[PDB]
Structure 1
């Protein structure tokens, strides 16, 4: 199947069960990274990986391993919400809900009112991925620092008093709290 499921923070013995269950229940291909076809992200431990972040940005189901075990038991893929990792990632059900209620193609609007952002090439997570996250959550990415109001990540160049210099953590915390964070605590 074209539709993908992504595992994250998943010990290899649980990974083994997932591969077997997917082989038996069908409906998914397992992919290493969250992409346009991913609808379900399965987390083994409650950790904010890049795949969790991308899964949230795309409004995926972010689920516990237990969904796989109960689905095997009951013979088919079952309702996801009882397994959704809402306590660890409050943004997950919010984006997932927005996404399924979306009339057309889903895109988040978290950053829709934010100025364009220049992302440091030295940023962590990697710049291409951090840019993907900004875009998926409704923000605009600038290709150069010139004229950009927000600069994200390590920046040792010339600084302007009318630009905000914010850590990558500002983007990530905004995404996981489903609210744009106050810049104060992310400066430099």
Structure 2
């Protein structure tokens, strides 16, 4: 019973069959439907910014090309991941993976550590709990109520307050993906 999971994302069904077959032959992983606390490797069939890619970066997983599985099968063992990192599409991926690997104790990002508390709309996309998870894992502070926050993320129907930034979910996601706190001005609702 492996203690790490691997997740497939943007994976055509015929490629999923191959990954499942390779993991059955090389062992070393359980396959999980979505990124979770045990996940170390996220395999993408097409470099689309899915929720699993985002969660993968937030947790400092390997975010890898499908070709990693193909080469590993050919050589009869799991090979080095570095050559297969999807850094062109997701520049933060190798950055967060490097820092996670250096961590003593559970890893937590610091991208958002200098931001004030954020309230995430219950109506957000990606869904509220996952978007909060992303904010927390990337070193941000999550408010339970809007009065607690200087930043409110996603659809919000309450009365607006003057010293609060009302930003799209994309502000969070583009920041995570680039490992830069994006300029709020471009994400205003």
* TM-score bin (small chain): over 0.9
Number of residue pairs aligned between Structure 1 and Structure 2: 188
Instruction: Give runs of ≥4 in structure 1 deviating > 3 Å.
Output: none
| 1:71, distance to aligned residue in structure 2 (A) | 0.2
- Residue 28 of structure 1: how far off its partner (Å): 0.1
Asked if the contact 2:119/2:142 (under 8 Å) is kept, the reply is yes
Which residue does 2:68 correspond to in 1?
Answer: 67
Deviations 1:58-80 (A, max 9, x none): 00000000000000000100000
Report the CA distance between 1:147 and its aligned residue.
Answer: 3.1
Q: Which residue of 2 aligns with 1:38?
A: 39
Q: CA deviation at 1:2?
A: 2.5
Q: Deviations over 1:117-165 (max 9, x none)?
A: 0000000000000000000000010000113100000012100001110
Matching residue of 1:14? 15
Q: Deviations over 1:82-126 (max 9, x none)?
A: 011011111100000011011221100000111000000000000
Q: TM-score, normalised by structure 1?
A: 0.99
1:1-44 alpha-carbon deviations (Å, 9 max, x no partner): 22100000000000000000000001000000101000000000
Q: Which runs of 5+ in 1 are unaligned?
A: none
